Write a protein that binds this ligand. Sequence first.
Ligand code: ANP
Ligand code: ANP
Ligand code: ADP
Ligand code: ADP
Lengths: 112, 567, 573
Amino acid sequence: VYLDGDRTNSRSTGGKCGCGFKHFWDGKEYDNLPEAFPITLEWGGRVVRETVYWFQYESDSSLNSNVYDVAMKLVTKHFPGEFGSEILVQKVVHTILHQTAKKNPDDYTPVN
Amino acid sequence: DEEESLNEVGYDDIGGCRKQLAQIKEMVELPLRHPALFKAIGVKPPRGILLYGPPGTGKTLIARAVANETGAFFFLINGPEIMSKLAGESESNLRKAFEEAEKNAPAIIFIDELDAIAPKREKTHGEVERRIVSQLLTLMDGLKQRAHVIVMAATNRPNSIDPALRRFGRFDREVDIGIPDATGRLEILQIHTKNMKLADDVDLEQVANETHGHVGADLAALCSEAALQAIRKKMDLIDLEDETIDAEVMNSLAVTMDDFRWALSQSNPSALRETVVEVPQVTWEDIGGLEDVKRELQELVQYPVEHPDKFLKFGMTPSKGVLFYGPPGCGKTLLAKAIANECQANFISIKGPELLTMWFGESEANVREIFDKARQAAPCVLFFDELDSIAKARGGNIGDGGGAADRVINQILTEMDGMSTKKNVFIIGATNRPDIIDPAILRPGRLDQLIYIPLPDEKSRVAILKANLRKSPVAKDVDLEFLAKMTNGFSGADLTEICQRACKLAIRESIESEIRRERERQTDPVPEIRRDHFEEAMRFARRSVSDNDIRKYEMFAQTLQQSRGFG
Amino acid sequence: DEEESLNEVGYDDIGGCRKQLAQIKEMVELPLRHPALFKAIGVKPPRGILLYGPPGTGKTLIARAVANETGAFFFLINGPEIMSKLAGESESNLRKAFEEAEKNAPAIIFIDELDAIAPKREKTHGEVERRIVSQLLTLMDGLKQRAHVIVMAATNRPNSIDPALRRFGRFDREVDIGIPDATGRLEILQIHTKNMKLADDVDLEQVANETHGHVGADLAALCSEAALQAIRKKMDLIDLEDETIDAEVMNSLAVTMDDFRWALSQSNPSALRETVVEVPQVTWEDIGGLEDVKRELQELVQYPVEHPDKFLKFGMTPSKGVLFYGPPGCGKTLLAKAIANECQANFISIKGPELLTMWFGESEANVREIFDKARQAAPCVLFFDELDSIAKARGGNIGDGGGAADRVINQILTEMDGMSTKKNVFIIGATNRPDIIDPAILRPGRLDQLIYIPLPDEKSRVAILKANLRKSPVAKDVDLEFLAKMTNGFSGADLTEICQRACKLAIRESIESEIRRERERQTDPVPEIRRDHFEEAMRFARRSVSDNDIRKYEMFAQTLQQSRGFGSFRFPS
Ligand SMILES: Nc1ncnc2c1ncn2[C@@H]1O[C@H](COP(=O)(O)OP(=O)(O)NP(=O)(O)O)[C@@H](O)[C@H]1O
Ligand SMILES: Nc1ncnc2c1ncn2[C@@H]1O[C@H](COP(=O)(O)OP(=O)(O)NP(=O)(O)O)[C@@H](O)[C@H]1O
Ligand SMILES: Nc1ncnc2c1ncn2[C@@H]1O[C@H](COP(=O)(O)OP(=O)(O)O)[C@@H](O)[C@H]1O
Ligand SMILES: Nc1ncnc2c1ncn2[C@@H]1O[C@H](COP(=O)(O)OP(=O)(O)O)[C@@H](O)[C@H]1O
């Protein structure tokens, strides 16, 4: 099987890596490599640290990362069944959206 | 005068007032027709009767009706008529009445506008008004010599009379003439449309149903407006001016249903911003599933009233409240109306916006009024929706320096703790955020039972779909069972949304077809909802609650269950 | 001599009020001229009519018109006049009037200003005033269909009369004479200017369009000021203010359009702060693109008001409001105005500052009044702009720690959940921050429909550019298609700004050329906009909505669409 982000036989289409091969990540076959951003959670006293991977440059429009789903998954995985946790969802959405800005079209530093 | 003699009102002209009319007849005719009877039992007859009610509910109409049946004696006193006289003459006027009625046989004295002559003492500045109030008090007190005289008075609202006139021996008794219900409006319409030619197409039942917040005066105005529009619609093309209308177009004048619809459209009801106290029209047939909850709710509101002797024998105090908690929309509001309908008891509903208004406006003193309306209309069911609204709006969970206590729920608890069990006033609360409810509410004696309303299962989903569709035509090929098997997670409102979307699509198609067919005229395609409309409507369907919220509610319920370990 | 009989008040003099005049004819003339008609049906005619209206709208004009154009006996009772008499004599006069009118028949009685006769009872600081009010009440209740006597009254405001006078058998029927519209103002101007001598370039339609808050008295004052300006302009140096004026200059007087423009400049409308209730003048042509949204709006608003039988047949409750969300400045108000115009329904607009005033002022009770006004103008469309303004003020994403609930939105919810469905009062809200809105609004029975208004595309941009240029005389040589192709991420406001800048540059160039030419001659170069201007105006073009701001809206719409994942449902059959 494919582990992660390897030079698969599938041909990359418009990828910025330049190898011409697609990349594998979390059970899916992607073109480029994601970035990484740190996020802190502090709901209900407990504090956890996490990293978020963001996909912004891609060929198909159904594959680019969606904030309202990434934040929902992050909250559910670490705070399952907590009452009134949508405030944390809104806060993390705002934080990731603010810190994912692309003011200059050169902030592309994908993780190895 | 000929028509005036035979147009005098009587008992037959009163509409929905049946219990009130019986009470008035009991408190007046009996102490006068047979004075000796009250001496045999020993109970003293009443001395003063006061009539409540918003404007235009027939308060003075009952006066004229009474002064036709009780043919003993009647003297009428008007508020403005008394107050319009010169100072000194007004005071000298009342005395005459109170001796004239004393000189003759058992008599009735009716004061029409009581608040016009006896307002609040401190709220009114003057000299002659205080003298008039004192004169009235002195006459009513001195009329105790039992000359078989009963004094009646009417007012728009009790909390405007001088409280000295509400004591024992002076207007002690009271009769409340409230807003008519659905049947009362129909009866009033039938009374009003007696000498008025109509057509066969109009049915008064629909008109009675649709006119929601009207009173007798509003119904009379609606009938007059309908007649006027009937005149304007058709006959107005003949009779212009300065002429005499021939009988051919006079006798051949009728009122149709469209005229009533128009008159209803252009009508603003008076008593609209008031709480509706009536028996609900929702039965167990409109609720799918929830079999256990129906029995648990019947044995809490119905058993204590049906079998008081059983409760007295075993000395168990009946429960006074119950709290419903669950996901947003499963039938929590339906259950309260259903249980109020089965026992045939009045229902009073208080929603979350009312509580938020009382919280923002610093008017928590209004709650003292609400329970009063519930106390008079006993038996009654009091329903509070979104008890967590205040806590949610104040930050929620650990959102600020609070402790889950506000200025409105405190008043609710204070008023609920002072309820006598002799009067059956059951209180039901509803919420979907049980974690932030005030723990003081759940203390025994206020709201003990805590019932969990879950998401419907397959059989309940089938029942819900069948119950929400028995109002519109449906083709026989539709298979509701497959829909219920396929949804698997919708709440009680998503199915209603699906049905509404299907009806909307059918309406669109029918209107489009009619427009298309109305183009060849210058040169029922869809009688029932088909099975292809539901397929399209299912595309715009979404789950209201995700599995995470189900997880939250399941965790709460399982913690409560694990806390209760016995056996 | 006494040629005042030629100057009277007829039904032709009352301009701009035709519906109210029709109602007055219905309920004041028919009952007492054909008494048997109501007897045959059996309904009782009204025994009192009240007239509303802001000051200077024509309440007393209708009194004189009815007085001299009925033929029935008419008695006039002035408000202040009856109160100026000595105590005791006022009651004698009132009783004498009510008894003398009853002797004749029919005996229409008009009370001019009863707000000075019967004020609020608690505000009746005194004793004789309450006696007068009680005397009025007693006489009114004594009209047991006696000789068909009808009583009329006029007031500047309903909420200044004793509430005892608005009961059954008393003044219960009311008329709502209000602010005139453009056609009404034009009719009033034509009525007033029927005697003075106008010039040949005076188009009263332009004057009627330009005046906004005026009422009949204000229009009369405007005409008087125009006449005064005409007199002062040229005849001032000929007139001498002595002896008599020459007949030559006296007869030869004309009021030009310049005088009317000057008079309009020196005008102070007395109804500027009132709420405008009128049918919008915007049609579907002013809006480019957004074809589907027009169809959805027509379905939501127009169908339930035209085919009630279809809704009754299938047992469906019509929707009662929509909520627009999208980037700022894309047509969220033009759509509301157009949908109000198509159905010929009145439009009442409540803006963001109006809401913020009540939140700061702690006067949310005024919200009730708004929902009364719409109830008096059915069918009507009620538009709330920037519903998130209060939420935006309270911090925004990170607020003061409170919940998503405030003082004004709660009152709006309370009032919306208590309106009869028989009335046709549609409710529309608009918000460009759909994530901070109160979730309680979106519940069923409320503003539950969500419509997304996106940024315009290339074809829609062509449509917008063509629509906005119907005023500027642009030369037929510039390719608007090229401008639409080049400008990609622009909203409607940006295109409007581009057009405005082009027009401003053209105006400046024309003015400069005219000044230079006149200076040269002391010893129309640009009658239309040409290509170069639009080039220069293109340099001052900026995108109102950034590229990183549309991500929020696009992702929100994508999630709302993705929540519906049952499009593969198929019956077995
Ligand atoms: N129950 C009823 N049945 C039939 N007609 C009714 C009824 N109630 C009211 N009406 C009609 O509506 C009118 C209401 O006016 P009225 O009886 O004066 O009410 P009110 O405002 O309580 N009177 P007042 O005592 O002067 O304050 C009646 O005169 C009838 O014409
Ligand atoms: N529809 C109209 N057409 C022409 N003139 C009008 C109209 N309405 C008002 N006016 C002008 O307004 C005058 C009448 O005063 P009005 O507008 O009735 O003021 P009011 O303060 O409402 N009346 P009142 O309080 O009874 O003195 C007329 O004589 C005209 O000068
Ligand atoms: N078990 C059920 N049976 C029939 N209808 C239901 C059921 N649950 C919900 N509904 C429908 O949902 C609508 C509103 O639900 P409601 O009871 O007001 O929700 P909530 O309990 O949150 O107040 C009702 O019109 C009703 O038709
Ligand atoms: N679809 C459109 N077609 C034509 N003009 C438009 C369109 N959308 C916006 N405009 C321009 O925008 C201006 C009004 O903007 P508005 O709709 O009030 O902004 P918002 O939607 O933020 O309230 C008008 O002058 C109009 O010319």
